Structure 1
Amino acid sequence: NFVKQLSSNNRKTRVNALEALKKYLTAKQFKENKQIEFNKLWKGLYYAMWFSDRPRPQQRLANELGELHGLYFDPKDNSTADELTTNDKAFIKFSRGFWKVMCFEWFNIDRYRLDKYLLLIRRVLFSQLKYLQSRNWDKKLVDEYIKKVLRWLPLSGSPKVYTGIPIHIVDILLDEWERLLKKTPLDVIIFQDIVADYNNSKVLREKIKEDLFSDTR
């Protein structure tokens, strides 16, 4: 099992597990399984990242792990005029598993390892909004992706999800968006509904009002 190998203490085996998984990810006609397999794979990747601490190499591991999101059926099929090509669904499931694993293990990260996971989240969010279509210029797929994103991270209605991840997402949203290099489908600014709707964490509402909206961009 990849998850068992990805969490292996030995560094060589851990790296080889990811190297082999680079192909298992693109192994077609096998990602149709339920989201539980994606959740298990991302749980294994969580420990795989956990086993790296040094700044320079951990950044390399984080970026190569974030590239896994784009590894899924790179934008070479030219699936224009298709609501779902059966490949973007795999990417959506992968992102959902990533967010579920990160949300569940948010408080299991020590103080020193928190920066590593913040960097990993930043890299994953960069790979997202970079690989939906060729880039984030697809309404028919952004509506599905935003629906599967709006319902978990920015919900702010269920206190089960910690408010730190939404705060980091708010902080890095505009920073990462400018990296893509415009009139992009930015329905994303969800935050208006969060501010309008009560019952949410007042800290989150204040942070988004003071920082996100106040931004000149």
Structure 2
Amino acid sequence: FIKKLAANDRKTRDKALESLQRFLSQKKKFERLDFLKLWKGLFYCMWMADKPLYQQKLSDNLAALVPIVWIDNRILFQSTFWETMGREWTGIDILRTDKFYLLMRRFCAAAFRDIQTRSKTALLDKVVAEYNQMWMDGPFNTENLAFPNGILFHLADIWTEELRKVYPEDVPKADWYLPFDSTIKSSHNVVLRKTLPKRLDRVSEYTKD
């Protein structure tokens, strides 16, 4: 699939996406490097997406691919996306950042929607804490300085907007903003710390765990 997902023909690329649903829905443990390889193919499936109508249907399709993944490696799937997007973000050109901005917006909402889905089966705070832990050793990791801040400003901008969309009526009490607070409290890059609060739209109404 990996070579086919980055083909020079959209028809070839699309047929690998439809075949990827069966591959991801497997009930077996996927190693982390296996998802690293897959997301490099999926990155170039969207890197080569041509029209804005298509490249926004594709982002919906890729985000809609998260619930297909097995529950045990669903967190690995998303954590590998945010790691494959951090390292490749700087090499994107100015005319391709706006299709990947929408891709991260669709994957941020997929994370919140997956928390919503799992909040019915198990208590919400465990689900959020598990997802928050994913953010900790991912984009919001303080130990690595290689992660771009252009993505983190994006996540701050869209964090509450996607949260409101996932729960139109009212969101419960949880540590929705934990990755941001722990980052501004301990980030080693002052530009991130000084301007992340200015961009995050954190509301105190629902943050008390």
Q: When the two structures are superposed, what TM-score results if normalisation uses the length of structure 2?
A: 0.86
Task: Measure how far apart 1:186 and its partner are.
Answer: 3.3
Is 1:141 aligned to 2:127, yes or no? yes
Sequence identity of aligned pairs in percent? Answer: 32
Task: Measure how far apart 1:133 and its partner are.
Answer: 5.5
Task: Measure how far apart 1:49 and its partner are.
Answer: 0.6
Task: Measure how far apart 1:33 and its partner are.
Answer: 2.9
Match in the other structure for 1:202: 190
Is 1:212 aligned to 2:209, yes or no? no
Q: Which residue identity does 2:104 align to in structure 1?
A: I
Is 1:160 aligned to 2:146, yes or no? yes
User: Closer, same or farther in 2 for the Cα pair 1:62/1:206, shift >3 Å?
Assistant: same
Is 1:119 aligned to 2:102, yes or no? yes
Further displaced range: 169-178 or 179-188: 179-188
Match in the other structure for 1:91: 74
Rounded to whole Å, the distance in 1 between the matches of 2:71 and 2:175 is 19
Q: Alignment length, in residue pairs? A: 199
Structure 1: which 4+ aligned runs deviate by more than 4 Å? 213-217
Task: Measure how far apart 1:209 and its partner are.
Answer: 1.8
Q: Which residue identity does 2:180 align to in structure 1?
A: F
Structure 2: state its 5+ residue gaps: none
Higher percent of residues as helix: 2
User: Closer, same or farther in 2 for the Cα pair 1:180/1:187, shift >3 Å?
Assistant: closer
Match in the other structure for 1:183: 172
Rounded to whole Å, the distance in 1 between the matches of 2:53 and 2:176 is 36
Structure 1: state its 5+ residue gaps: 73-86
SS of 1:130's partner is helix
Rounded to whole Å, the distance in 1 between the matches of 2:50 and 2:93 is 12
For the 8 Å contact 2:35–2:77, the answer to whether it is kept is: yes
Rounded to whole Å, the distance in 2 between the matches of 1:170 and 1:44 is 27
Task: Measure how far apart 1:147 and its partner are.
Answer: 0.9
Rounded to whole Å, the distance in 1 between the matches of 2:27 and 2:118 is 22
Is 1:19 aligned to 2:18, yes or no? yes
Rounded to whole Å, the distance in 1 between the matches of 2:157 and 2:172 is 21
Task: Measure how far apart 1:110 and its partner are.
Answer: 1.0
For the 8 Å contact 1:59–1:119, the answer to whether it is kept is: yes
Determine which of 37, 41, 56 is the counterpart of 2:38: 41
For the 8 Å contact 2:132–2:179, the answer to whether it is kept is: no
Is 1:174 aligned to 2:160, yes or no? yes
**What are the superposed Cα offsets for residues 135-188 of structure 1, whole Å, 9 maximum, x if unpaired?**
556322322221121122112442111111111111110110000122242353
Q: When the two structures are superposed, what TM-score results if normalisation uses the length of structure 1?
A: 0.83
